[PDB]
Amino acid sequence: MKELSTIQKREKLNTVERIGSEGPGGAYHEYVIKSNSMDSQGNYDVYETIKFQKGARKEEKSQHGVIDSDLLEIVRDRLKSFQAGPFSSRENACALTHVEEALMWMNRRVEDRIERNVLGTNTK
Amino acid sequence: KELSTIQKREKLNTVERIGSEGPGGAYHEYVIKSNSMDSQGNYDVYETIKFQKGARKEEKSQHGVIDSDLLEIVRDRLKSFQAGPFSSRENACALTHVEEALMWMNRRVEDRIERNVLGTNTK
Amino acid sequence: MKELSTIQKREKLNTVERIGSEGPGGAYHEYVIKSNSMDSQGNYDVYETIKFQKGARKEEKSQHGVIDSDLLEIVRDRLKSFQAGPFSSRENACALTHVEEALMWMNRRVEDRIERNVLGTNTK
Amino acid sequence: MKELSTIQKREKLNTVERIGSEGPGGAYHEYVIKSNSMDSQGNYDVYETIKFQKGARKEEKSQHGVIDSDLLEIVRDRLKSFQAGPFSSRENACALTHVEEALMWMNRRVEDRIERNVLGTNTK
Amino acid sequence: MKELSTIQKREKLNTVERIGSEGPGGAYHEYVIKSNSMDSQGNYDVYETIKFQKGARKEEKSQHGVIDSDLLEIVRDRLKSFQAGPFSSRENACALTHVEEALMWMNRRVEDRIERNVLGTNTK
Amino acid sequence: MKELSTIQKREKLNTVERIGSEGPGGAYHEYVIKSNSMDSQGNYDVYETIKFQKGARKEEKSQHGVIDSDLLEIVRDRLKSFQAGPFSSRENACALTHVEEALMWMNRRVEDRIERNVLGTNTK
Ligand SMILES: Nc1nc(=O)c2ncn([C@@H]3O[C@@H]4COP(=O)(O)O[C@H]5[C@@H](O)[C@H](n6cnc7c(N)ncnc76)O[C@@H]5COP(=O)(O)O[C@@H]3[C@@H]4O)c2[nH]1
Ligand SMILES: Nc1nc(=O)c2ncn([C@@H]3O[C@@H]4COP(=O)(O)O[C@H]5[C@@H](O)[C@H](n6cnc7c(N)ncnc76)O[C@@H]5COP(=O)(O)O[C@@H]3[C@@H]4O)c2[nH]1
Ligand SMILES: Nc1nc(=O)c2ncn([C@@H]3O[C@@H]4COP(=O)(O)O[C@H]5[C@@H](O)[C@H](n6cnc7c(N)ncnc76)O[C@@H]5COP(=O)(O)O[C@@H]3[C@@H]4O)c2[nH]1
Ligand SMILES: Nc1nc(=O)c2ncn([C@@H]3O[C@@H]4COP(=O)(O)O[C@H]5[C@@H](O)[C@H](n6cnc7c(N)ncnc76)O[C@@H]5COP(=O)(O)O[C@@H]3[C@@H]4O)c2[nH]1
Ligand SMILES: Nc1nc(=O)c2ncn([C@@H]3O[C@@H]4COP(=O)(O)O[C@H]5[C@@H](O)[C@H](n6cnc7c(N)ncnc76)O[C@@H]5COP(=O)(O)O[C@@H]3[C@@H]4O)c2[nH]1
Numbered sequence: 001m002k003e004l005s006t007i008q009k010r011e012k013l014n015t016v017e018r019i020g021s022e023g024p025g026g027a028y029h030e031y032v033i034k035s036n037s038m039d040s041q042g043n044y045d046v047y048e049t050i051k052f053q054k055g056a057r058k059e060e061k062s063q064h065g066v067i068d069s070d071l072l073e074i075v076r077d078r079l080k081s082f083q084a085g086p087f088s089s090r091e092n093a094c095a096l097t098h099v100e101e102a103l104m105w106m107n108r109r110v111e112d113r114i115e116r117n118v119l120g121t122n123t124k
Numbered sequence: 125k126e127l128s129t130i131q132k133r134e135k136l137n138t139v140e141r142i143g144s145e146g147p148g149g150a151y152h153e154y155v156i157k158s159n160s161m162d163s164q165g166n167y168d169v170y171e172t173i174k175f176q177k178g179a180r181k182e183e184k185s186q187h188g189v190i191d192s193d194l195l196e197i198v199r200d201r202l203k204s205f206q207a208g209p210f211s212s213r214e215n216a217c218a219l220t221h222v223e224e225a226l227m228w229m230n231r232r233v234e235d236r237i238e239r240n241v242l243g244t245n246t247k
Numbered sequence: 248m249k250e251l252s253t254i255q256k257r258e259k260l261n262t263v264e265r266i267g268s269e270g271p272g273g274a275y276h277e278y279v280i281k282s283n284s285m286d287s288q289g290n291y292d293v294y295e296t297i298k299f300q301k302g303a304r305k306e307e308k309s310q311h312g313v314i315d316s317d318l319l320e321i322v323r324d325r326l327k328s329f330q331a332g333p334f335s336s337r338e339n340a341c342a343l344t345h346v347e348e349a350l351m352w353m354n355r356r357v358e359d360r361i362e363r364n365v366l367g368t369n370t371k
Numbered sequence: 372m373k374e375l376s377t378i379q380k381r382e383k384l385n386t387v388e389r390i391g392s393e394g395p396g397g398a399y400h401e402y403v404i405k406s407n408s409m410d411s412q413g414n415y416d417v418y419e420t421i422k423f424q425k426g427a428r429k430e431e432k433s434q435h436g437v438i439d440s441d442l443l444e445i446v447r448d449r450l451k452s453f454q455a456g457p458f459s460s461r462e463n464a465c466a467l468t469h470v471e472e473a474l475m476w477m478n479r480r481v482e483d484r485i486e487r488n489v490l491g492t493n494t495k
Numbered sequence: 496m497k498e499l500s501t502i503q504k505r506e507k508l509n510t511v512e513r514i515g516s517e518g519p520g521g522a523y524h525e526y527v528i529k530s531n532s533m534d535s536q537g538n539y540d541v542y543e544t545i546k547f548q549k550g551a552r553k554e555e556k557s558q559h560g561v562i563d564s565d566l567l568e569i570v571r572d573r574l575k576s577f578q579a580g581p582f583s584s585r586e587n588a589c590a591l592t593h594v595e596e597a598l599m600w601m602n603r604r605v606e607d608r609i610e611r612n613v614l615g616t617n618t619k
Numbered sequence: 620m621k622e623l624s625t626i627q628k629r630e631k632l633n634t635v636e637r638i639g640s641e642g643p644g645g646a647y648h649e650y651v652i653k654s655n656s657m658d659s660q661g662n663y664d665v666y667e668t669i670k671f672q673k674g675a676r677k678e679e680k681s682q683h684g685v686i687d688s689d690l691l692e693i694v695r696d697r698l699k700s701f702q703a704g705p706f707s708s709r710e711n712a713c714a715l716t717h718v719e720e721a722l723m724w725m726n727r728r729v730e731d732r733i734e735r736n737v738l739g740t741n742t743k
């Protein structure tokens with residue numbers, strides 16, 4: 001089974017699973033999010049596949065997809081919206097600031113790799 | 125509708141809001157589309173992500189993903205990259221920040237359980 | 248020596264001191280907090296002893312006691328109360344957020360150890 | 372109920388309770404930590420009271436007691452010892468750095484209050 | 496006085512003073528660092544002024560000078576060097592990561608202000 | 620080259636350069652901040668030199684100068700002022716809290732070295 005062990009343990013809406021095998025860097029590049037609930041006719045309320053960029057965006061060889069910062073930017077935008085709205089919380093603000101600091105560190109990774117001419121290459 | 129992102133250079137994809145504001149004032153559908161293009165003018169990447177919109181117990185809701193799911197995926201990938209040959213301190217700081225975000229997201233869920241407001245449209 | 252070198256250096260109310268010997272894990276399991284002041288009769292204004300859990304809560308020869316998360320939860324509650332009251336501060340708020348993040352990491356440790364089924368055993 | 376809602380939800384050794392009434396600053400100044408487990412004799416295996424300084428130390432009719440930085444310094448010492456011993460973890464390290472940064476902010480509070488000549492007085 | 500109350504309280508090499516009057520945004524734009532020790536001559540061993548950009552750089556009547564990210568980038572370079580050398584420490588590491596995160600947030604400000612077309616203007 | 624590679628890439632007011640050679644502990648002890656702009660006469664609008672303490676302050680052939688805490692205290696004071704003024708921001712607040720945590724870690728280093736009697740000596 002390829003079920004992710006998550007920090008949340010109670011009242012989970014969905015489970016997440018690794019899909020396929022290990023790829024470049026030792027990571028997976030496909031995930032499925034699927035609901036802990038079934039519809040009236042016995043099917044998943046949610047069954048959602050996320051495919052990540054696998055290989056350089058410049059080869060046609062590559063599995064072209066999303067990058068982790070895209071997912072974090074989506075979460076960042078939603079948390080900002082929630083904080084502007086009626087159901088804001090301190091827990092949200094702490095989550096949002098850590099999300100933004102993670103994105104800034106991912107951008108650090110992009111910029112030092114640009115400086116070293118190694119972005120888009122399989123090099124440490 | 126296009127997201128202004130923290131990354132400014134060498135961006136692979138663009139992210140856009142889909143639809144209108146919903147419960148809590150947020151959007152519940154997003155599109156990620158590649159900045160690169162194929163021969164016929166079709167995006168090389170065009171993926172929609174739909175979020176839970178309305179309570180999961182209600183059959184009329186838009187059932188979908190929740191943000192901690194996406195953060196757990198990113199967490200798992202960062203752990204795999206740190207165990208692999210292309211690890212970095214930048215990766216490690218990002219991973220710890222993602223994990224602390226997930227910890228605060230769980231604190232929210234648990235607080236809302238404590239106050240008997242989880243799954244309700246209330247602060 | 249058994250007197251703790253603390254982060255605070257001036258206007259300390261109390262001193263903290265280790266009691267006994269190193270135990271499981273290389274740590275001490277009993278501490279005393281004693282006042283830096285003495286009463287009219289020449290006695291400590293404060294002399295408090297804290298005994299930690301030492302060995303498995305299941306087996307009877309263990310020294311049964313408190314755990315560190317209990318102490319941080321007390322401090323978290325008091326800081327929350329102070330922030331609601333009239334003598335709140337930014338310094339309090341930073342302290343409380345770090346206390347809660349420490350508690351969340353202690354719970355990460357507990358949840359990692361339940362998942363590995365090592366909780367309550369002398370296993371790294 | 373005076374029982375504290377804690378961060379950890381599963382496998383709790385002990386329960387923590389506030390004791391007394393709201394005091395200076397809106398906080399409680401006594402807490403009890405009691406075991407979730409039982410002897411054969413019918414009593415709690417753990418039942419420990421922690422009384423905090425309530426009112427200034429110089430005033431003779433105050434409830435002299437511990438302060439929160441004492442408790443976090445104990446936890447800091449134990450965490451350092453665990454990290455130097457055989458059962459270390461990244462979760463311990465993250466908790467320890469947060470505990471030390473909380474102690475650093477508590478000291479900032481003390482030092483700021485000395486600056487403003489309000490340490491030991493009921494004022495912001 | 497115009498002397499800064501600093502985090503460091505003991506064994507301080509220098510004092511810092513703000514110079515001039517409060518300017519745009521409510522801040523001071525000139526500072527002096529001077530040694531706590533004097534030479535045989537009687538004058539300070541260190542007396543260093545730092546002027547900050549006051550007014551937009553495009554306007555020639557402005558006081559052109561340094562900006563805060565310059566100073567933090569100097570400190571970041573020095574901490575990186577110390578860590579690569581013989582006298583490294585965990586305290587240095589925590590300081591460096593915080594300096595770098597402060598720089599990332601200063602950059603976030605600049606980029607936000609570019610986004611809103613307010614960079615180099617006297618507005619929030 | 621001796622150019623500092625900075626976290627900010629866009630709309631930079633100034634460049635920062637190392638001057639001289641590596642010194643004690645592996646770090647540079649002199650830095651120039653110079654404008655990315657020039658006046659009506661082809662001369663830098665800005666050209667500060669910052670010289671750091673190099674060698675123990677209490678010996679006399681040492682180069683006496685500033686220390687990194689001095690620069691962060693300046694930045695801390697300015698950020699506090701900007702946050703009290705009309706052009707405050709969340710980005711400023713995050714930068715300021717990181718600056719202050721950096722300073723408290725610098726002070727941790729100083730007090731640790733005092734306690735070990737290594738402050739002012741070339742020793743790890
Ligand atoms: N243009 C562009 N902008 C970006 O922001 C970006 N982020 C990643 N990439 C590139 O996407 C492609 C897909 O990654 P893959 O898993 O195949 O290889 C990756 C992966 O195996 C590993 N890696 C280690 N840590 C990370 C990490 N944090 N994010 C991504 N990849 C990582 O290290 C390889 C090279 O990374 P980059 O050197 O950033 O180039 C990648 C690569 O060309 C980017 N390309
Ligand atoms: N069982 C369960 N476990 C979870 O982890 C979980 N996380 C979210 N939800 C529920 O999904 C549904 C879809 O959210 P919607 O946008 O309609 O309403 C949400 C949204 O408008 C707003 N909100 C504010 N901050 C957040 C946030 N951080 N995450 C999600 N929703 C948030 O506040 C409403 C109630 O939130 P919850 O009270 O968490 O219940 C939600 C809701 O029932 C969960 N349900
Ligand atoms: N049920 C339960 N819930 C908890 O939250 C909990 N926290 C600790 N314990 C158990 O209490 C007992 C007292 O600790 P001791 O010092 O004797 O051994 C400990 C100690 O030597 C070491 N250790 C390393 N890091 C830590 C740490 N952060 N907290 C406690 N103990 C730690 O590693 C041993 C086993 O740890 P756990 O595997 O958590 O079980 C402990 C232990 O059985 C708990 N038991
Ligand atoms: N000498 C000395 N060194 C210390 O480190 C210290 N820490 C606390 N105290 C003093 O202990 C006494 C007991 O606190 P009480 O709850 O009655 O009043 C407290 C309390 O109601 C409230 N308060 C707000 N935030 C905090 C906080 N973080 N810690 C303690 N008290 C706090 O604000 C009052 C004055 O605080 P201090 O001004 O720090 O003086 C206290 C007080 O004289 C100290 N005294
Ligand atoms: N090109 C460029 N790149 C930079 O990185 C940068 N950083 C600052 N500046 C500009 O320098 C000039 C000098 O600042 P002054 O104190 O007069 O006004 C400042 C000051 O009064 C206030 N302010 C609030 N927070 C800050 C802050 N964190 N840094 C600087 N100034 C700040 O808000 C005004 C406008 O700030 P910017 O809108 O960033 O433009 C400034 C201004 O034109 C920059 N210009």
Ligand SMILES: Nc1nc(=O)c2ncn([C@@H]3O[C@@H]4COP(=O)(O)O[C@H]5[C@@H](O)[C@H](n6cnc7c(N)ncnc76)O[C@@H]5COP(=O)(O)O[C@@H]3[C@@H]4O)c2[nH]1
Pocket residue numbers: 506507508577582583587642643644645672673674675676686687728729732737738739740741742
């Ligand atoms: N009195 C006093 N109060 C201070 O706050 C302070 N901070 C630094 N110093 C002393 O200034 C002198 C100049 O530093 P130098 O680069 O030549 O040597 C330094 C430097 O080579 C290296 N070092 C490693 N990390 C750091 C660091 N974070 N800050 C400064 N120096 C550092 O380790 C040497 C000894 O450091 P200290 O042992 O703190 O003593 C220094 C030294 O005597 C101080 N002296």
